[PDB]
Amino acid sequence: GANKTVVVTTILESPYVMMKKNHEMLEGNERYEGYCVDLAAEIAKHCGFKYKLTIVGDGKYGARDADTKIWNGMVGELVYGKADIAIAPLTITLVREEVIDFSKPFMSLGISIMIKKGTPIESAEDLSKQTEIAYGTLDSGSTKEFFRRSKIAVFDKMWTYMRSAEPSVFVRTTAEGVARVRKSKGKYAYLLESTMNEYIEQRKPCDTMKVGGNLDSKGYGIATPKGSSLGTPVNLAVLKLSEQGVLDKLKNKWWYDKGECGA
């Protein structure tokens, strides 16, 4: 039919979407800033639609409950028609690509290790061969699923430890996992996406480090309900923005230019 204001689902995750400090003075899309706030503005311009940013109610990326088969998070908001598009650091996975459409990826990432500086760990293999330092992942996301499914020996060894560890090694939010690394005196390491890991390393108090190579190679995509009319224009817009240098400019804006830990 006639063009309608598009409901965008997204998630509070630095530096993608962040509440402006004075947000209670502000209304609508003006409450928020970040890489995905900027990317939403670009996508909507290039597709000629009006839109409203909404933070996912349950604060989750998206996983399907094994008993109910109900999708939660941003994936769930698309699946049940509560949002028209998800513009967020939402990982392209086979289990999701089957229930939602994903654009070509707008950013690459791989799973990585965050340590408190000085922690005697340089790799996933190192983590797996010891017990002094606990380690975990975010709940309700692609990292946790990577470990759960992995048939690779070292990651399977890691998963077997993590699923049964006490107290729990899993966290609800990235901020929580970061707080735990910062406050555990080197006795907790966090497995999170390289992109997030990199942003945090350049933020005060400058007490974390990314170590080792990435565990996998993947991407974030703009997601739409399966068969949405938005899917095609959205994908073309991501490719156009890539080719125009805009994605690179936005990455520099929200990563390099936001660096607080020196050169």
Ligand X SMILES: N[C@@H](CCC(=O)O)C(=O)O
Beta carbon nearer to ligand 557, 195 or 208: 195
Letter string b/e over residues 143-178, b meaning 16 or more CB atoms within 10 A of that residue's CB? bbbbbeebeeebbebbbebbeeeeeebbbeebeebb
Residue ranges in 51-70 that form contacts with ligand X under rule CB under 6 A: 61
Binder among 34, 76, 89, 136 for ligand X (CB under 6 A):
89
Phi, psi of 200 (to 5 degrees): -65, -40
Beta carbon nearer to ligand X, 38 or 139: 139
Q: Does 156 bind its own copies (CB under 8 A)?
A: no
Which ranges in 48-133 belong to alpha helices (H)?
73-79, 94-97, 124-128
Q: Does 245 bind its own copies (CB under 8 A)?
A: yes
Cis check for the bond before 89: say yes or no (omega within 30 of 0). no
Q: Could you tell me the smallest distance in angstroms from the CB atom of residue 199 to ligand 557?
A: 15
User: Binding residue per annotation — 89?
Assistant: yes
Distance separating alpha carbons of residues 249 and 19, to the nearest angstrom: 21
Binding mask 186-205 for ligand X (x = CB under 6 A): ------xx------------
Residue ranges in 108-167 that form contacts with ligand X under rule CB under 6 A: 138, 141-143
Piece of the chain touching its own copies by CB under 8 A; list 21-29, 48-56, 131-139, 240-248: 240-248
Nearest to ligand X by Cβ — which residue?
Answer: 141
Q: Does 217 bind its own copies (CB under 8 A)?
A: yes
Beta carbon nearer to ligand X, 49 or 106: 106
Q: Does 93 bind its own copies (CB under 8 A)?
A: yes
Positive or negative CA dihedral for 78, 84, 89, 90? positive
User: Binding residue per annotation — 119?
Assistant: no
Distance separating alpha carbons of residues 44 and 24, to the nearest angstrom: 25
Do 217 and 90 contact (CB within 8 A), yes or no?
A: no
Distance separating alpha carbons of residues 162 and 137, to the nearest angstrom: 9
User: Binding residue per annotation — 96?
Assistant: yes
Return residues touching ligand 557 (CB under 6 A).
92, 104-108, 217-219, 238-239, 242, 247
User: Binding residue per annotation — 174?
Assistant: no
Q: Does 107 bind ligand X (CB under 6 A)?
A: no
Distance separating alpha carbons of residues 75 and 20, to the nearest angstrom: 25
Binding-site entries for L-glutamate: 89, 91, 96, 142-143, 193
Residues found near ligand X in the complex (CB under 6 A): 61, 89-91, 138, 141-143, 192-193
